[PDB]
Design a protein around this ligand. Structure first.
Ligand code: XYP
Ligand code: CA
Ligand code: CA
Ligand code: CA
Length: 513
């Protein structure tokens, strides 16, 4: 009754609402809202289960009671049976435990409301609200409202680094349900990458895709994109091309995983389409979202020095294991330029285009990456080099501060910018200490800051860590690679980094130059 958590009006963006059912379509329309404002029209259904949903893990806790409330409206003959269902997954139970929580017969032509009070089991999470009728009728909703009963530049990274670059992190579909993580990002980061949720296999749609219309979807990414847009955090798209996390069928003549490899001519179609539509859908669904960067091609250069010498950097043709289905089809890395051309053609001008890579400071590879990228920069096609920076706490050796600076500098010497895209600093299972860790973090931020304070053509425009805390890292906890412990308290790396910039220099992290 007292306090509000979700107010979805639909004025600008789809507010994290997605088609329930693979062929159900969603579209926001001007003046079909409640009170002639903007509204969310659900078309092409197929069953009473088909509909629309929104995962609201960010705002709805287990074991709290919520006022759920939606204005709906239809346009058929006679009356309609509208349902409001809350589902979840339970951290124990571990199956999608559903529940219909309000029924309401609703007549043609009229902005009727629907509601109910509901409490989820003490434990539940990854909630989710969804709207259906007992028929297969088009409908419209607006004003989704959920409620429960009951410049000062700050000591935060984004403010601290406001005059330098964006300081980012990573959300995923697990973390997007964590109270204190939400609090953390809001407090500290002004950039977010989707860990998995905007990769090809999370966004392509098999069913009725075609060589010149590749069906795509932001459903997986939606809660993330919505939370960032609503809170003015920018976003790096990640990633359009990658030998990995991309389903095989995308490469096959009959959109089967076990098909036949398609012509080049055919992949040019499928590639262009995926990119075009992928930009279309963002623009369409989340236009207020600041899409400031995108990883156009990801990790396309071999780690094998034999391949960087003779084969331009081409990975081995094939699928899985670190083989490239792209190289499989195209015979080599010609496809990189192609992809950056489509990207350039459809990306918003404010969204800068990056080649993203790891082991980016290992000489034979570094040289390869940098050659490629300079060539693209000079052609108007690339804007920046993405240094993934999966390094360790060692001040020396392979990913050591010298080899690191060397690459950084060599990249910047291209003209283009550089971003530090997926930074983590591995204690190699306790081999190094949280201090030698701190020292390395402090060193990296420091090297970025130097570049920025020098020339000038190129700049480091963002520095983002691959995860929010040590409890959510693809490297495993045992390597405590991040700035925050499993309880979100700052680690020694956090202040090492929290003190490179003097208070007289902080800024609006919500408005960073
Ligand atoms: O997508 C990320 C990729 O860019 C990096 O190479 O490896 C970790 C992945 O999550
Ligand atoms: Ca809105
Ligand atoms: Ca509205
Ligand atoms: Ca598959």
């Amino acid at each position: 009754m007292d306090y509000e958590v979700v107010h979805d009006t639909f004025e600008v963006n789809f507010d994290g609402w997605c088609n329930l059912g693979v062929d159900t379509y969603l579209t926001a329309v001007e003046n079909e809202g409640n009170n002639g404002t903007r509204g969310m029209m659900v078309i092409n259904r197929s069953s009473a289960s088909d509909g629309a949903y929104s995962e609201k893990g960010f705002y709805l806790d287990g074991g709290v009671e919520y006022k759920y409330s939606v204005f709906v409206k239809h346009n058929g003959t006679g009356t309609e049976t509208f349902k409001l269902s809350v589902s979840y997954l339970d951290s124990e139970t571990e199956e999608e435990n559903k529940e219909v929580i309000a029924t309401k017969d609703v007549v043609a032509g009229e902005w009727t409301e629907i509601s109910a009070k509901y409490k989820a089991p003490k434990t539940a999470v990854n909630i989710t609200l969804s709207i259906t009728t007992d028929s297969t009728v088009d409908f419209i909703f607006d004003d989704v409202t959920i409620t429960r009963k009951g410049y000062a530049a700050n000591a935060v990274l984004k403010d601290m680094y406001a005059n330098y670059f964006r300081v980012g992190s990573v959300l995923n579909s697990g973390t997007v349900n964590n109270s204190s993580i939400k609090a953390l990002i809001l407090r500290e980061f002004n950039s977010i990458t989707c860990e998995n949720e905007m990769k090809p296999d999370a966004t392509l749609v098999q069913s009725g895709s075609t060589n010149t219309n590749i069906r795509v979807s932001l459903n997986r990414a939606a809660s993330i994109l919505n939370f960032c847009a609503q809170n003015n955090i920018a976003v790096r798209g990640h990633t359009l091309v990658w030998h990995s996390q991309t389903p095989q069928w995308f490469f096959k003549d009959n959109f089967q995983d076990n098909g036949n490899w398609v012509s080049q001519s055919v992949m040019d179609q499928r590639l262009e389409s995926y990119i075009k539509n992928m930009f279309a859908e963002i623009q369409r669904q989340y236009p207020s979202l600041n899409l400031y960067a995108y990883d156009v091609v990801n990790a396309a250069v071999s780690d094998d020095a034999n391949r960087t010498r003779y084969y331009g950097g081409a990975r081995e043709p094939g699928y899985g294991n670190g083989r490239s289905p792209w190289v499989q089809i195209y015979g080599d890395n010609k496809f990189i330029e192609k992809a950056f051309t489509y990207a350039r053609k459809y990306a918003p001008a404010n969204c800068k285009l990056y080649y993203n890579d790891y082991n980016e400071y290992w000489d034979h590879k570094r040289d390869c990456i940098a050659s490629i990228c300079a060539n693209l920069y000079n052609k108007g096609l690339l804007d920046g080099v993405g240094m993934q920076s999966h390094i360790n706490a060692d001040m020396n050796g392979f990913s050591g501060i010298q080899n690191y600076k060397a690459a950084l500098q060599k990249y910047i010497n291209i003209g283009c910018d550089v971003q530090i895209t997926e930074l983590d600093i591995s204690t190699e299972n306790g081999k190094f200490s949280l201090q030698q860790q701190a020292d390395k973090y402090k060193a990296v931020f420091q090297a970025a800051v130097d570049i920025n304070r020098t020339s000038s053509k190129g700049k480091v425009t963002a520095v983002c860590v691959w995860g929010p805390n040590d409890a959510n890292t693809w490297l495993g906890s045992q390597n405590a690679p991040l700035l925050f412990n499993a309880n979100n308290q700052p680690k020694p790396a956090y202040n090492a980094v929290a003190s490179i910039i003097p208070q007289s220099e902080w800024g609006d992290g919500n408005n960073p130059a």
